[PDB]
Amino acid sequence: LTDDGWLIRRTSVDTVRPFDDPSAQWMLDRAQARLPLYLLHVADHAEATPPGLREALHAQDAAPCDGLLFSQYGLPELRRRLDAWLAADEEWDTAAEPLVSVAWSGTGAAIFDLLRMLKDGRPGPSAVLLPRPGWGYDMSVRDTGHVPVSYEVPPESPHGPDPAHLEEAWQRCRSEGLDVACILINPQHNPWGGNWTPEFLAAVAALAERERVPVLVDNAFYGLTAEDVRPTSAVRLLGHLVGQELLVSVRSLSKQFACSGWALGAVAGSPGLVSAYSGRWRCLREPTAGFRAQAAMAAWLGGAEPERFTRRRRSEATRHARLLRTTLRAAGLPDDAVLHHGGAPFTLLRPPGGSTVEEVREQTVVRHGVLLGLERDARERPWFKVWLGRDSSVFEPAARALGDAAAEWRYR
Amino acid sequence: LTDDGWLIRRTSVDTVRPFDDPSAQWMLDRAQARLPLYLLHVADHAEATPPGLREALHAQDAAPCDGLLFSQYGLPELRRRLDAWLAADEEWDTAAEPLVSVAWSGTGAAIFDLLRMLKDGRPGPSAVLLPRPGWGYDMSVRDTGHVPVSYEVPPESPHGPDPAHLEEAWQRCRSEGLDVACILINPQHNPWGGNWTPEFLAAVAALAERERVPVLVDNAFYGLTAEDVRPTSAVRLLGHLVGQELLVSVRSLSKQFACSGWALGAVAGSPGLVSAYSGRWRCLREPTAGFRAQAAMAAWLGGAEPERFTRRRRSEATRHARLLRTTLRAAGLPDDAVLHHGGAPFTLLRPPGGSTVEEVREQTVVRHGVLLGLERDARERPWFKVWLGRDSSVFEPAARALGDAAAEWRY
C-alpha cells in the first residue's frame, strides 16, 4: 500500500469507461502496468482507516442496525455526539442555540439540498456567491436554479480572499439584476489552503445581515490545518447569524477521519434552516440510511482515537509540506514556485514556464506515476495542487517520485 | 426481538422532535412505555439482515475499502455482479444492450436525479406521468421542475391500472399544455401490491414510442411477489425501448435483501440515459461512496444465500397474508375489506365505516401497538396498508394484536 495502483485496479478497471476525464485513462494505464501510482490530486486517505474505526463497525453486530431509522436528523447517539464535539472543536458561541443534523450521503449533497431549499419561492433570477476556485459548488449552484457569481480567491494569499474580492462579486450581482440567495465560504480552503480571516468573515456577515442572505460554511478541513496554524472558526465568529436564520455550516467527518466511503457529516446552525433541510429538503429525497455507519461513528467519535488520529494527520500535513518543499528545492524549483499556507493540506506548484500544463501533468504520471491536481487563478494562470494528507507510507515515496519528475522541469 | 420498540427507543428518542408527522409521537409514546410496538406501515426488515451479509462486511477488512471509488458507475465487482444477476432474474431481452450502474444513496434519490436530468433543456412546463398512489414520487417530480400528472391505480384491482387510466392522465397533459418528460411505472406496486399487466405495459410502450418519452421502471418489489405470483417483467417487455433511449429501471437491493441502511440499488437501461445519470447527474452531486458496502454486497451476491433468503421472504409474505386473512375474518371483517393481490407484500384493509380513519389509526397504536399505513383511492376512500415482509417472529404477535384491535371495529 506504498502506492495507489491497487485502488485503480480494483475501482476503475471495468468493461465501461469509468469516467471520461483524461486522467481516468492516465491512472488506468499506470495502474494496469503495475507501475507505482501516487494519487495526490483528490483529498482522500483511501489507504487506511483510523485505528478502532473498522472494529467499531463490527461491534455494531451486537444489535440490529441495518434498517432505516425513524429520525429526520439521523441516529440520535451520533447526532448528540456531533453537537457536543463540534461545539467544543470549533469553539461555538455558547449564547447561540444551533441545531445539529447528520448528513449521510456527502456534504456536497447536503450543500445541493441546502441550495435548492434556498431557491424555493424565488421566481426571480438568483445568485449564489461562492469562491473561485471552489470544490465543486458551481454545478450544485447551477443545478438548483441559481447563477454562480464567484469572488476571487488568489492562490498567493496565505489568508485567502479580502473584502474587496467579495464586494467585486456583489457588484456583479447588482449590475446583472440577480438576487443573492446564499454566500458560500470555505475558510480552510480547498484547493489553495488559505486560512481565511476574521476581517473577511466580518465582511461576509455584514453583507448577510444587510441583504438578509444566509451564509453557508463548508468546514471540511477545519480540523486539518498545519500544526502551526490555528483555524479561523466561522461558526464562532458568525454566531449572531444563527438566531437570525442566516447561518448553516456543513462539515464532513469522513474526510478528517479517513472514511470517505461512509459519507458521514454534520449540518449545523440556524434551527429553521437546519430543520427544513433535514426533513423537507433531504428526507423526502433520500432514505434514512446509514444506521450502522452512524452507530459505529458515534462510538468511535466518542472515544480517544479521534484526537490521536487528528494530531497524526496534522503532524503529517506539516511534515509532508516541509518534505515536499525541500524535495522540490533539490529538484531545481525556485522557492517562490512552491506555496504552502497551512490552512488545509495542499501545496501549490507553479508549473514550468512555456510547457502545456496538461501535457506536463500527464507526462508526470506516465514517467513517474505522480498525479497532481490542476487549478487556475483569476487570470487563468495554472497551478498544480498537491494533496498532502496521505499517510507517510504513501507520501514519502510519492514525494521522492515527484522530485524525480520535477528535475525534468525547466525553470528559468 | 418480537416487536419494534427497540428501534424507536434507539433511533427516535432525542432532544429534538424526530419528525413532525403525528405518527412520530404515537410511536415514541408506545416505545418509551416499553409496550409492544409493531411497525407495519413502512416496507422494511430492520429486525435482521440475511445470513452471511454482516459477515461479508467483516471479510472486507482484508484490503483497504473505505476510500472514494474512481468510477462513476460504482464498484466494478458489484456493477458486474448486478448486470448478470438482473439480466437473469428479470429475464431481460438478450437482443437489448443495456448499461447497468450502481446507486448507493437510495433508489428514491436515483429517481430524483433521473427526473432532474429529464428536465434539462426544457424551459416549457413539463409533466411526469406517475401512479396515484405512489411511493413518494410526487415530491421528486415537483422538486425537479415537473408537474405531477397521475394515472389512477385502483386498490381493488389485483393487476393495478388499465390502459384507460393511462390515457386519462395523458389527456390531462394534452388539455393543460404540459410536455410529458417521463412515464413512471411500478409493476409490483407499493402500496396496493398489484402485479401489473403486459396489456398495461404495452400501452405504456406505445405512448413512450409515439411521444418519444422515456419510461422509468421502479422494480423495488420485483423479487418479492407472493409464492404463487410470477412478476411481470417490465424491462423484458419493454426491451425494444433500451436502444431508443427510452428506458431506465431502478431496483433497490436493500429492500429485498433486508439491508435498507446500506441504500444499494441498480440503475439500468438505455446507455445514454444511464451514463448521463451516473456521471453528470449523480457524481457531480454525490461522492463515489459506499466502497465497503458495495464490496460486501458483491461478495454476498456471489454465494447461495441470496436465493435462499428471497425464497424465505416470499414464503413468509405468502404465509403472513394468509394469517392476516384468517385473523381478520375471525375479528369480524367482511372478505371484501381484506385484499391481498400478491404482487408485493401488502394487505389492504378497509377501515370501519363512520370512524375518523386517522383516529382509528392512532388508537390502534395506543391500545394494541400496531401502526398501519394510510392510503386513499381516487375518490378519497381510505384503506389501511399492512406490510407483510417482516420476520414471523415479529409478524405473528403483530397479527394477534391487529386482530385484537380489529375486533373493536364496527362492520
UniProtKB/TrEMBL annotation, chain A:
<keyword id="KW-0808">Transferase</keyword>
<dbReference type="InterPro" id="IPR015424">
    <property type="entry name" value="PyrdxlP-dep_Trfase"/>
</dbReference>
<dbReference type="InterPro" id="IPR050596">
    <property type="entry name" value="AspAT/PAT-like"/>
</dbReference>
<feature type="domain" description="Aminotransferase class I/classII large">
    <location>
        <begin position="68"/>
        <end position="334"/>
    </location>
</feature>
<dbReference type="Pfam" id="PF00155">
    <property type="entry name" value="Aminotran_1_2"/>
</dbReference>
<comment type="similarity">
    <text>Belongs to the class-I pyridoxal-phosphate-dependent aminotransferase family.</text>
</comment>
<dbReference type="GO" id="GO:0030170">
    <property type="term" value="F:pyridoxal phosphate binding"/>
</dbReference>
<dbReference type="InterPro" id="IPR004839">
    <property type="entry name" value="Aminotransferase_I/II_large"/>
</dbReference>
<protein>
    <submittedName>
        <fullName>LmbF</fullName>
    </submittedName>
</protein>
<keyword id="KW-0663">Pyridoxal phosphate</keyword>
<keyword id="KW-0032">Aminotransferase</keyword>
<dbReference type="InterPro" id="IPR015421">
    <property type="entry name" value="PyrdxlP-dep_Trfase_major"/>
</dbReference>
<dbReference type="GO" id="GO:0008483">
    <property type="term" value="F:transaminase activity"/>
</dbReference>
<dbReference type="GO" id="GO:0006520">
    <property type="term" value="P:amino acid metabolic process"/>
</dbReference>
